[model samples]
Target chain A: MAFAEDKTYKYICRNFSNFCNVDVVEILPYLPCLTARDQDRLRATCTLSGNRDTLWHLFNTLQRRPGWVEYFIAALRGCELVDLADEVASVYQSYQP
Target chain B: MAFAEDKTYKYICRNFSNFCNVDVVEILPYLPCLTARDQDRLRATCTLSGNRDTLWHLFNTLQRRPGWVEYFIAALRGCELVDLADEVASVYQSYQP
Candidate 1:
């Protein structure tokens, strides 16, 4: 089905990262596919370098988890990141896999 | 620090999996280390054979993800599975890695 008129990706994109204040460690518990080692690596990398590439690396890492897209949506919602949640929902709704 | 007298591993071990009604898929989103492919494989193996070995394999796969132990504990807590959470907490607290 086509997206509802009110809930488009554009809408979500306007402010998705606005509420992404939670740290990776804080949300680590919600992501089950990652190992303690992986978490340590991620923390180290992010600490050493905070850049767009770092975020991308983090996203890639998170995607390795089972049902990652849905989990990301839930994480956003759980942390009250509505804009981010909406953005993720829109992206995953049309995701092929 | 030592565990509080009230929250010991022995206590958690008594009833960890008791309320584990949620399916693997339901909790897939929480595990960031596993891939959708990994989830598919786990489902297949469990469907083919509900054995202790299968559970062990799943645990092994999950361990590949980041902060998996902590994530598991949180998953248990998120699912309101306090016993399981405590059990995982105890095991991981003393876990070498």
Candidate 2:
């Protein structure tokens, strides 16, 4: 128990500190077989795939920065997925630290 | 001019005053024809559709509660969507207010 607590404390400090390199990678059994049509549809959402770094930055910021989700949704005012995406935003509230 | 500011003030005061009961209904010409198999697959995501109120609560919470999206994702540790879901999450950080 003591060792676990120590590990948690260490993790919290390390993970929470700076928080720059923090990112969540989707682990999957196999890469999605996205057809050209599907890829085109996804690309229509915004310029995401064009900049891999920006995509990563956006992901980290959305899941990390304070008041980030609301702002992100605001930028999505005209996007097709705003409704579903905005609703999905509320799910992040369950996590504290 | 001043009237515009007044309107903005009123709108802000009114909209932000009671954030509850605010839900987004998807607007589309024709709903995507979700097949029975697709419906079953979606239902398998969780007991999301079992209770309407809870589903709304989850949606509202996800879009409203601060830091809510993260908790929702964390709860999804073992789920199949973690990767895609987490990636989608970062899109929320663009909203500032």
Candidate 3:
């Protein structure tokens, strides 16, 4: 299916920031599609919001890129935001496209 | 029309933001062609250089979209910069490919 058509991922993105405070900058290295400029923008958001709700922006941003859900969950898992990762997988896995 | 090979509008090259201030990246969302992703980028990068420089990144990304110049101008006018439409359209009078 297409990125926007997947209600599962949409659900996760909508609810993610509310349960996460795991410094989004830590997940950048795991994301490959982003530009250095993208990182800079992220840094600015983190600073401005005092790291609050930056993930909402991040999640929505990544939602636009290719393979974002995979990249995002990997970033979460690799960044050791395991709680977030596990939550994503438990929800994401059952869908199985 | 070669999607317009006239090239008169070329003179506005990256200059759309000249008279554009508060409405800089505010031109997204309603802008056609560029996706919601581009909208957030313009949003995210707006904070980078206090938004005066926001158009730099926006220009590059925008140029990649076919006929972004029109969409950009439309968004500008739609975002309350109606005067810019005339100012921008004037460039349509002279230039080359």
Candidate 4:
């Protein structure tokens, strides 16, 4: 619930919009209110569809936004998005010079 | 005051700890308290010391953390760290496949 301001949230919404066909706005509110079951459902669904890459795109987009990195991570962790988290960490480490 | 929790903050403190000899922990709270003069002093001093790279390292490090990206960008914007922001944005773009 303690996400960044509306401006940054809007930014994430915009970037996500550019990347995928889904309605990021509708999903945004649910992001905060996600129950464990709901989160698991999302992960399983994205995994099933092989849309996991886009999810990482979403995660990185959120990571770069003003202040959602914490909330983003929390949501991922809550949803047991461990593989996603690892993939993120891998790319992040590779970003180093 | 609206930052994430102590755990993530500590994680940031830990990453920063590995990169430089400075006490990032002490400076953590003051990041929110930064006055223009204070931020200017820090930037000017870093630039003067040729530590701009380290500052970028700090920025990127914060970016990868859970929730600091938003706060980090805000502080950068407030300090008019436009070039640094551009550098970050540029690298972020380059990270794409």
Best by lDDT: 3
Winner of 2 and 3 under TM-score: 3
Tens-digit lDDT track for model 3 on B1-94? 2234235334445464455353545666656677777777777668754354576666557667666767767776777777776666566433
Instruction: Give lDDT tens digits, candidate 1, residues A1-97.
Output: 2232223333333553653454553344345455546755665675687543344455557755555666656666655767767866875575443
**Model 2: residue A68 alpha-carbon error in angstroms:** 40
A13, model 3: CA deviation in Å? 4.1
Across residues B1-88, which tens digit of lDDT does each residue of candidate 1 receive?
2233223323332232333354454555666667779877777766764433234345556655655666666666777667766756
The CAPRI quality class of candidate 2 comes to incorrect
lDDT of model number 3:
0.63
Runs with alpha carbons beyond 4 Å of true place in candidate 1: A1-22, A51-53, B1-97
lDDT of 4 by residue, A1-70 (tens): 2233343344445655443433222232224333323434544455465564446444444444444544
What lDDT score belongs to each candidate, Candidate 1 first? Answer: 0.53, 0.33, 0.63, 0.42
**Ten contiguous residues minimizing lDDT sum, candidate 4 chain B:** B16-25
Better of 2 and 3 by DockQ: 3
> Candidate 1: how large is its RMSD?
16.6
Clash statistics: count for each candidate: 19, 24, 0, 5
TM-score of chain A of each: 0.61, 0.32, 0.77, 0.34
Cα lDDT tens digits for candidate 2, B1-97: 3333333333423544232222111100011122223323333332454433333333433433344444433433323445534543443333323
Off by over 4 Å in 4: A1-3, A17-33, A52-69, A73-97, B1-97
The TM-score between candidate 3 and the true structure equals 0.49
